[PDB]
Symmetry: D2
Subunit: 123 residues, 4 copies
């Protein structure tokens, strides 16, 4: 039931747009982040993921990657699409954000972690 | 010099991956062979797809990828960086999140397991 | 103005904590009442002990604390910051790691679950 | 078997010293980190934790907090003490590091995550 294809929003204000998913579970899309950790003018980036098909679960598991266009940075999201009591969709995700570093000896700090909630937009 | 994602890699738990191209866009897919599971099902090669960052031609770009487990309801996401070590050997330093499937959203809080991984080239 | 850890807090899952002093050192202990479990055992108030940072008198210091689950083999660690919101209400923004017990070190990779939590004062 | 009381070292080079643990599972100690994320002269800080007693497990679960003396920063560790095949002790931990921020609206990036391995020192 829960479908990833469409236009979602975050508790941070981000805007993601996913296209349709396949047979292979794959989808594509674009992210418009509203916050950055990088001091660079934010720009609409592409996200590539995949959705789980293992059994027609009305509430699949998903993950996707964001290739930031404005940072040497990479973000990954994983989560599950849930069907509320309101009858409403809900991505409950969690993400890891890697920062680019110049030494294997500094990598240990290269990574942050958090959540995000996505919902849908009207119209 | 050149840290390409492309190639065959193994990893600290025994797991093994195989990654292909990398478009002019960093996009790339491959397969995954875990060596271990949180679940109870026989392992099956699973497909992977990711993107390599290229926003200031760096010789050790970051990357990320999803793994669509074939034998399971859940999914894992990996993010790291392609380091060129001192030995001159490439070394993927990585980290993931394994998202398990839960029946009830009020049970979400527990579906997320976190970990590391270090990949090293297989290829002789 | 003043974000003290001291007081009674509840949290987004229903869980509830009670924290006491805060020495001249930030050290402090209290109890914990989870509302939910990864395990199968009846819940029992568990003890907690932490430390509040005070290295440049900030009005919203960071903190951390461990929870020594009484009904279980495992442990959870919380770290966050004591925000003074705009409503003027304190708000603990937090995050944890729940370390489960495993029998075999080769099974370590899966013992770590990660999550959030937001605490809000109970006290009327 | 696995005992936390003593002097350990990391894969980063850090030095921690824990005292004895109680009956309540509690211990104390001091951390000497060898890397920082903060640009401040590093200084030996105090760590307060607790160890799990729930059944005499020769391989308990532990967690402790580090009140950094040189940063507005807090670190938390959790892990398990393991008894190797070599007969040797091994803390396999994982930590979360909170950075101090000035706005609830920037908190989302306030947190990094990683590992650490501790072993023992000789002498
Ligand atoms: O700092 C960078 O290099 C790019 C940051 C991208 C924004 C991150 S993605 C995780 C979190 N969720 C969002 O929507 N934005 C921040
Ligand atoms: O147990 C499942 O739900 C399928 C997971 C398959 C492997 C996970 S991905 C994180 C960790 N590292 C590996 O190489 N494999 C495990
Ligand atoms: O299931 C166990 O092993 C005991 C865990 C008790 C509660 C965990 S701590 C993280 C999460 N947030 C809560 O308030 N409780 C759970
Ligand atoms: O940057 C700060 O504010 C203090 C950093 C303390 C060092 C951290 S603790 C996690 C990781 N492990 C270590 O031993 N050091 C880094
Ligand atoms: C997303 O778009 C909505 C309206 O379509 C807007 O109000 C919000 O500010 C946008 N946030 C972005 C661009 O991430
Ligand atoms: C820890 O001490 C050892 C020797 O006791 C030393 O070689 C190492 O550099 C130290 N690291 C620190 C001070 O964190």
């Amino acid at each position: 039931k829960c479908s990833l294809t469409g236009k979602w929003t975050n508790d941070l204000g981000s805007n993601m747009t996913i296209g349709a998913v396949n047979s292979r579970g794959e989808f594509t899309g674009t992210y418009t982040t509203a916050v950055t950790a990088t001091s660079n003018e934010i720009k609409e980036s592409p996200l590539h993921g995949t959705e789980n098909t293992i059994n027609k679960r009305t509430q699949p598991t998903f993950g996707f990657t964001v290739n930031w266009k404005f940072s040497e940075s990479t973000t990954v999201f994983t989560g599950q699409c849930f069907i509320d009591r309101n009858g409403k969709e809900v991505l409950k995700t969690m993400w890891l954000l890697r920062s680019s570093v110049n030494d294997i000896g500094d990598d240990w700090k290269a990574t942050r972690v958090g959540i995000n909630i996505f919902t849908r937009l009207r119209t």
